[PDB]
Amino acid sequence: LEIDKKNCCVFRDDFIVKVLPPVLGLEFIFGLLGNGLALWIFCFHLKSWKSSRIFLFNLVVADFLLIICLPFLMDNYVRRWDWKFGDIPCRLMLFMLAMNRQGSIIFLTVVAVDRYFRVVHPHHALNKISNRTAAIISCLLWGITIGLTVHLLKKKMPIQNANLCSSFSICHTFQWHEAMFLLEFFLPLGIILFCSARIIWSLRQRQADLEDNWETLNDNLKVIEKADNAAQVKDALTKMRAAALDAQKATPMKDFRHGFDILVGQIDDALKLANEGKVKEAQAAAEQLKTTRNAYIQKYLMDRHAKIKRAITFIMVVAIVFVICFLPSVVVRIRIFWLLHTSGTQNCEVYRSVDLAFFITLSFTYMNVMLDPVVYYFSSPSFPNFFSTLINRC
Ligand SMILES: CCCCCCCC/C=C\CCCCCCCC(=O)OC[C@H](O)CO
Ligand SMILES: CCCCCCCC/C=C\CCCCCCCC(=O)O
């Protein structure tokens, strides 16, 4: 509440002391349960480590850095920022808190960039990265996360004012490091938003092409069944045969590839019956095409339509989690940069309501430990298959 030293106006509303501690606890419970489940599924349930799970497992590592500090953080907010712990416990908590935020920001982009190449550029060299190469990338990206946040271990803590454990970054005017801080968030924000746009755009296109081929197939058969001309059926099978050949090249399955062989072959048989004036004998042969697509095709259409739906769901939650967790604190920090430049630090009451917003959006930053489990769930069908086979045992 009182004006701190070195031109620093800080406020501790009662809403922060009363509402945030139980929020920190809920984020601690679901975060430990979700990441603990992920840690079990990643490391013990499945034995195959792909390049995507290696990049994705870093979020689990980045989340446990915040999970460890959450009980201590609760102890600080209930004590009104009275840091009962020592010097070293405070430096480590600030380091791990920044390591969790900066680490989650970086690896949520790597997850989006990885899925961007799996979808948009399937044949690019970055899709064939070895597990050792992906492990080198993750280590190099952790080394970057170290350097950006290692400075929080140099400053001695706490600071008497009762002792407070905080890196007062909301009392620093906009300078070079603060510009770096904003750029370290907006470049990943631009990459994730662009990748999410391209992936959703490309995947909704593939689904629209599958349903367009399947539409022209069922629709054309209804023409053949309702046909009263011998020439109408010759042209109707033409659009079907072109649709059956387009669907073969679209699929990026052993019993589904040979199903189009039988599908096209049955069209060729009725194609000869259509050219011989067999109006009734070609309309009937076209009904055998209804029994082959149910047994052979419709299953692969639903499997791919679900694979596409889960991929779009995955890239959306990665973008949504990145925004609703890290953007609110950024906007508030930008508003403080303006007020320090506009109003200065003579009258502190200009920062009363803004400080309440900062610690509110600060708990949004801590939400990434209970929302990353949602990212893990939609990453691969192995996660829902873990709980489905676990519930199979009843
Ligand atoms: C930082 C500000 C100044 C610099 C701003 C730079 C902005 C563009 C960056 C990268 C584009 C290239 C990567 C993403 C799109 C290209 C994908 C690619 O490489 O695809 C190749 C090929 O199509 C596969 O088959
Ligand atoms: C080299 C250019 C660096 C650009 C950094 C990121 C761009 C956006 C920067 C902040 C936008 C709002 C500015 C914050 C308060 C500015 C007050 C001031 O004039 O000092």
Residue numbers in the entry: 11 to 171, 174 to 264, 277 to 418
Sentences from the study reporting this entry:
The hydroxycarboxylic acid receptor 2 (HCA2) agonist niacin has been used as treatment for dyslipidemia for several decades albeit with skin flushing as a common side-effect in treated individuals. HCA2 is an important receptor to understand since it regulates homeostasis during physiological and pathophysiological conditions implicated in a variety of diseases, including cardiovascular diseases, multiple sclerosis, Parkinson’s disease, Alzheimer’s disease, neurological diseases and colon cancer. In addition, HCA2 plays crucial role in nutrient sensing and anti-inflammatory effect using various signaling mechanisms. Here, we report the cryo-electron microscopy structure of the HCA2-Gi signalling complex with the potent agonist MK-6892, along with crystal structures of HCA2 in inactive state.
In parallel, the crystal structures of mutation induced inactive HCA2, which were expressed in mammalian and insect expression systems, were both solved at 2.7 Å resolution (construct ID 8519 and 3378) and share identical structures with RMSD of Cα atoms below 0.5 Å, with no differences for the bound lipids. The engineered HCA2 molecule is not capable of binding [3H]-nicotinic acid based on saturation binding assay or mediating ligand induced signalling and it is likely that one of the thermostabilizing mutations, S2877.46V (superscripts denote Ballesteros-Weinstein numbering), locks HCA2 into an inactive state. Comparing the HCA2 receptor in different states, upon activation, the agonist MK-6892 forms close interactions with helix V and ECL2, and initiates substantial conformational changes in HCA2. The helix V converges in extracellular portion about 4.9 Å (main chain) and moves outwards in intracellular region, while helix VI near extracellular region moves inward about 1.9 Å, where MK-6892 binding pocket shrinks with the movement of helix V, as represented by W1885.38, H1895.39, F1935.43. In this study, we present the HCA2-Gi signalling complex and mutation induced inactive state HCA2 structures, providing comprehensive molecular insights into HCA2 ligand selectivity and receptor activation which may share unique activation mechanism with δ-branch members.
